[PDB]
């Protein structure tokens, strides 16, 4: 089997991407944030505290004839940006782009943090990291991809995120028309439950490539590119007037600036992030100071190849017995 679904930026800055997901019988379609950095499929629901729901589409398990309460099961997640949510668990039928899993754990939110309430476009998350990170207690549950894997034509999914444009998540096949050149594959460590890999280095604009190992995660659920302070300093040094602002919480730059590209290494291959992808617009409405899309990972504890990086590539998440990651230009 295979599946294919269009993924759409939630706003003009590409802050996140949503993908429609069918849950239950009859289908309830929710727009979920596909997140290769986490492993829970959780949704706004009829059980969510009313004051915490503001425009989201909810899952109502009582209206799904295939929903079954998973007895005694609860979940709770606190993300690396202060965000959190929690609730109970149903199993139900879940389909993405024509690919169907029966008995998928659907984590129904009783509580969500403010940041989720305030984002009316995201109805929940669909985790695509390794099932070892799933938070369901007392019995951990499998991700959608883990449940689908054995049925797929090939045990893979691909992320093709757009810059200011729609893109695609495919399951079970590689669309060879979706990229240019070849896919370069690189080793993955699953030791922390992430799609964790080692970039071979970077360049800033048309500058010389610096060969240096950068360990990080491919994370579709993180907006920006978080890299070591040395690397980030080297990038913003090429932008006149850019500076790190403690009050704002990162590097800012004059909105009139032209940003250089940023290149990262995948083995001997190179992915070029156009400078425009690194512009996240005014720090506050009407400001002429703009927020940078490359920021320091110091104090995150890990480097993160978020959407800024991933949207410059066609990315293969290969879930073979020994997982690997593939990157191609597009």
Its sign, for the CA torsion 295, 130, 49, 64, is positive
Give me Rg for the CA atoms of the chain. Answer: 20
Tokens of 204: 């800033």
What experiment produced this structure? Answer: X-ray
Reduced to 3 states (helix: H, G, I; strand: E, B; else coil), residue 118 is helix
- Of 64, 95, 199, 297, the catalytic one is 199
* Among the four given CATH numbers 2.40.70.10, 3.40.50.300, 3.30.930.10, 3.40.120.10, the one describing domain 175-330: 2.40.70.10
Rounded to the nearest angstrom, the gap between the alpha carbon of residue 147 and the centroid of all alpha carbons in its chain is 19
Return the closest-CA partner of residue 166 out of 5, 301, 309.
Answer: 5
Point out the catalytic residue in the list 14, 33, 35, 307: 35
- Active site annotation includes 46: no
With the CA atoms of 213, 216, 217 and 221 taken in that order, what torsion angle do they form, in degrees rounded to the nearest 10?
Answer: -130
User: What residues are paired with 184 via a beta bridge?
Assistant: 327
Give the whole-angstrom CA distance, residue 189 versus residue 179. Answer: 25
Contact 83, 113 (CB under 8 A): yes
The widest CA-to-CA distance across the chain, in whole angstroms, is: 60
CA 182 to chain centroid: 23
| Beta-strand pair 156-160/314-318 | antiparallel
- The secondary structure element, H or E, covering residue 234 is helix 229-236
C-alpha 168/C-alpha 170 separation (Å) is 6
Task: Specify the domain boundaries for CATH 2.40.70.10 within the chain.
Answer: 5-174, 175-330
Cβ–Cβ < 8 Å for 145, 154: no
Considering only CA atoms, which of 113, 134, 130, 135 is closest in space to residue 122?
113
Q: What does the buried/exposed string (b/e) look like for 27-54 if buried means 16 or more CB atoms within 10 Å of the residue's CB?
A: ebebbbbbbbbbbbbbbbbebbeeebbe
Are the C-beta atoms of 147 and 104 separated by less than 8 Å? Answer: yes
* 3-state class (DSSP) for residue 128: coil
Catalytic (active site) residue 35? yes
Q: What are phi and psi of 66, to 5 degrees?
A: -105, 0
**What was the resolution (in A) of this experimentally determined structure?**
1.5
Contacts of 264 (CB under 8 A, 6+ apart): 199, 201, 202, 214, 270, 271, 273, 305, 309
Class level of CATH domain 5-174: mainly beta
Provide the 3-class DSSP secondary structure of residue 229.
helix
**Structure-token pair, residue 252:** 């800012």
How do 262-266 and 210-218 pair as beta strands? unpaired
């Amino acid at each position: 089997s295979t599946g294919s679904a269009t993924t759409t930026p939630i706003d003009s800055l590409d802050d996140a991407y949503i993908t429609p997901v069918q849950i239950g019988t009859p289908a309830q379609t929710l727009n979920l944030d596909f997140d290769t950095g986490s492993s829970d499929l959780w949704v706004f629901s009829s059980e969510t505290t009313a004051s915490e729901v503001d425009g989201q589409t909810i899952y109502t398990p009582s209206k799904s004839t295939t929903a079954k309460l998973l007895s005694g099961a609860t979940w709770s997640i606190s993300y690396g940006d202060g965000s959190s949510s929690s609730g109970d668990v149903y199993t139900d039928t879940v389909s993405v782009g024509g690919l169907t899993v029966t008995g998928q754990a659907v984590e129904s939110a009783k509580k969500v943090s403010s940041s989720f309430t305030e984002d009316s476009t995201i109805d929940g998350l669909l985790g695509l990291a390794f099932s070892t990170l799933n938070t369901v207690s007392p019995t951990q549950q499998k991700t959608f991809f883990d449940n689908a894997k054995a049925s797929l034509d090939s045990p893979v999914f691909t992320a093709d995120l757009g810059y200011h444009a729609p893109g695609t998540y495919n399951f079970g096949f590689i669309d060879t028309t979706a990229y240019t050149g070849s896919i370069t594959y690189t080793a993955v460590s699953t030791k922390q439950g992430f799609w964790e890999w080692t970039s071979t280095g970077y360049a800033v604009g048309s500058g010389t490539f610096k060969s240096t190992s950068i360990d990080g995660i491919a994370d579709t659920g993180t907006t920006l590119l978080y890299l070591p302070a040395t690397v980030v300093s080297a990038y913003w040094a090429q932008v006149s007037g850019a500076k790190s602002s403690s009050s704002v919480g990162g590097y800012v730059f004059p909105c009139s600036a032209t940003l250089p590209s940023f290149t990262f290494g995948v083995g001997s291959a190179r992915i070029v992030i156009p400078g425009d992808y690194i512009d996240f617009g005014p720090i506050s409405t009407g400001s002429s100071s703009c927020f940078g899309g490359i920021q320091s990972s110091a104090g995150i504890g890990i480097n993160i190849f978020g959407d800024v990086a991933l949207k410059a590539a066609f990315v293969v998440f290969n879930g073979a017995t020994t997982p690997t990651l593939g990157f191609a230009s597009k």
